[PDB]
Nucleic acid binder design. Sequence first.
RNA 1: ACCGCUGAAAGCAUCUAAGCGGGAAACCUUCUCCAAGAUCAGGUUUCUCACCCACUUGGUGGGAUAAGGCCCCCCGCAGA
RNA 2: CUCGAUGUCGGCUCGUCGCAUCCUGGGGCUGGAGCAGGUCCCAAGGGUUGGGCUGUUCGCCCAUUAAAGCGGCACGCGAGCUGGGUUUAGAACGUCGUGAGACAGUUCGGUCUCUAUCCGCCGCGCGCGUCAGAAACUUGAGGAAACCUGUCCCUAGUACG
Lengths: 58, 146, 213, 174, 37
Amino acid sequence: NAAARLNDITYNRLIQGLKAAGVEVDRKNLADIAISDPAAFTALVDVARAALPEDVNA
Amino acid sequence: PTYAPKAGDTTRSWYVIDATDVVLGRLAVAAANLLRGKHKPTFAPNVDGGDFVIVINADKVAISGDKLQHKMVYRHSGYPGGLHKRTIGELMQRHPDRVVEKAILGMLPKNRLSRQIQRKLRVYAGPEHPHSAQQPVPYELKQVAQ
Amino acid sequence: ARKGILGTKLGMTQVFDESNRVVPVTVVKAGPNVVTRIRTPERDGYSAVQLAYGEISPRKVNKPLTGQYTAAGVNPRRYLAELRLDDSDAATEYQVGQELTAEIFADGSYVDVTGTSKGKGFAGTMKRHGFRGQGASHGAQAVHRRPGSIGGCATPARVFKGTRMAGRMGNDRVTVLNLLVHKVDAENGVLLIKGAVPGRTGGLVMVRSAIKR
Amino acid sequence: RIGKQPIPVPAGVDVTIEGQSISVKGPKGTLGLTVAEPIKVARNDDGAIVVTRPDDERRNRSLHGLSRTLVSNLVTGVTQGYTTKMEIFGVGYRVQLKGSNLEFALGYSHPVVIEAPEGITFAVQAPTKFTVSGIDKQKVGQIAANIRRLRRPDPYKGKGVRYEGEQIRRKVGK
Amino acid sequence: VKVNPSVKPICDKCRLIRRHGRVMVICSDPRHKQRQG
RNA sequence: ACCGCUGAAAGCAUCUAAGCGGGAAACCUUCUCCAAGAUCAGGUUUCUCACCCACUUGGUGGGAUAAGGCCCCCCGCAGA
RNA sequence: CUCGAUGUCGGCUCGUCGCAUCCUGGGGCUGGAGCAGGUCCCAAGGGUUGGGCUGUUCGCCCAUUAAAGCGGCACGCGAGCUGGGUUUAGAACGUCGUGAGACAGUUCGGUCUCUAUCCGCCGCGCGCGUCAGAAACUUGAGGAAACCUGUCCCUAGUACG
């Protein structure tokens, strides 16, 4: 959550996006990346942001 | 595993909030999480991490008068009765810093770190902050996304 | 505002007034042996003055006191006490090393007097608070002078904080209000006050102006 | 319906708007008044003051009309001072004016010397009649309320101030 | 005044109002000045 | 509590929703007392204000000593 | 809940609490002229007595007071007190029963243990700490104790009547 909010995105939307992309990555190693390599974390955020549909409608 | 809880690996910077228009709730919450370090990926509840928070213009905290004249503060002594009942507005006229501080303490966890963190807080009623030798870092509030 | 002076209680006597009435009088020594130190509100925020009175050996007083008195430029005194004046600015009132006697009183003014109380020692509630101790006649086993009960039984399963129990009394800063100044013997520094004064003969008494009157 | 009532400005000496705050001049002294921010205030082509706000909040209407009466109070007050007349219906009383403030005495000791406020005129029309005037209904009426209930006017005989009527009750005998 | 947990009008000359939420009766004649508790 | 000025919503009215004043042994100051172990451990002033060894000079242990204090002695209307 | 124990009435002593207020204070209304006085709302910081009777709460009563408050905490408080009464043994009048014996019917007499471990409380100390070591003098965050009231005279036998 801390890393995501530093990247201007919440946990909810982060995980939803990762699911839509198909990134079957755990939270353990995701957090390790979030610490030892924020850049790759942000890249994953951009992937998730791209993967999100549009809004709160369906 | 974790790499944060390592002695010496804590950055304690000085953030400043010009808490005038801001409401009491949101103010205290932002100070609370920011002070404890929940904005950092290295948050570690076992240790006294986080950055220092400075509250400015505490006298101006946006509290509705409807509560200034109804919300009360209670300080029991230990003696029969001894309930030192006092109006929050009067506390704002005398020592508003105690008002804000109290509000934060009730938002922090009932533990010892409450005290180790509490000692990292500086609240001054006035606008001017004597401690400028360090680096003040003005902090602003927002709703992040969603 | 709160003018005053340090003195020594010299005991009690009595003196007849002009209307042929007895005045019980406490005798206070307050002569030309009182000097000052200024506590400005611009450093401390108090607006007060320390008053010194007495006579000690310069080889008995320790060195730091000789430093403070050196700053004053004044021969040492046994006692030193800070008298709160007024919440205003004051400033133009008392100077460093000013002679203060009992001539500061106008032979009739009411005064507020304060000082340490006399020793009594550890005593029961009969003196500490004044209890109507049970009697000891009609069967009472052994309760003469005992406090008796304290509190309830189950619900308040404790004792309320600050009950009336045995303790030590004496040596307390008692303030007695609105004593009538009978007469100022400026020639000997002997101040004649109607009424009793806290403390034993030889103790330090602080006498200052009354405000209620 | 007061929302349809504009306020002409007979004097307009310095009647203006300084940040939702109206400063008023005229024959008399100066006045000011904070304008409620929710209500939009502007000046008319002929100088008359126009105060407006729609509705859908009730208090918008209350503030609109209230505001109209306040502006009328400022203008009519500065161009025509307001006054209240007091008649005394009692026994053993003389209106005294020692120095520059009123002293009253009717059936009790220690005559009351009303502490006069700043910006007010007192006047005596008779030993049992006097008046008061000023440029604010809140300031003139304040002194008018601090003289009553002190020795409550008994509706049996009468011993005090009436505001030219008030249908004061009378005794029912004994 | 006549304080009670019920309010109505005594006559066809009075007004019912809410001062601070407190319901009250004013017939402008002191025999009741009825108040909602 | 009671009471009131001004004054809308409701062209009026209205102590009230803006806003204001009076308003008591209760409340908080002011009066008396303890009180900075109140761990934000406060404030002002002042004296001493500069010795030597072990180990890894230091970082660390040890010994001495100035200011000042304490223990023993004669005592107190201070006192278990 | 408790029977390998929760010792109950009343009284004495010491304190606390509520307010649905006995008084003192502050208001309205009146079939409130005035003194007095009816009812109702707010207000619980103080005071709220002394005696006769009763084993007694209760209650009655005298003489007073500004008034002589109602209630809660094991119908407060027995590891602090009393033991009259209640709830043991003996005795006894009356009643029930053939009797042993009973009776919320009465009457005579009838022992109250504790060297205080812990919490809590009352007072006083040792050490550490308050980022050099000592000494003097203060503030006062925030708490404590106190907080009652009558009489007479003047204004004035005035206002009212």
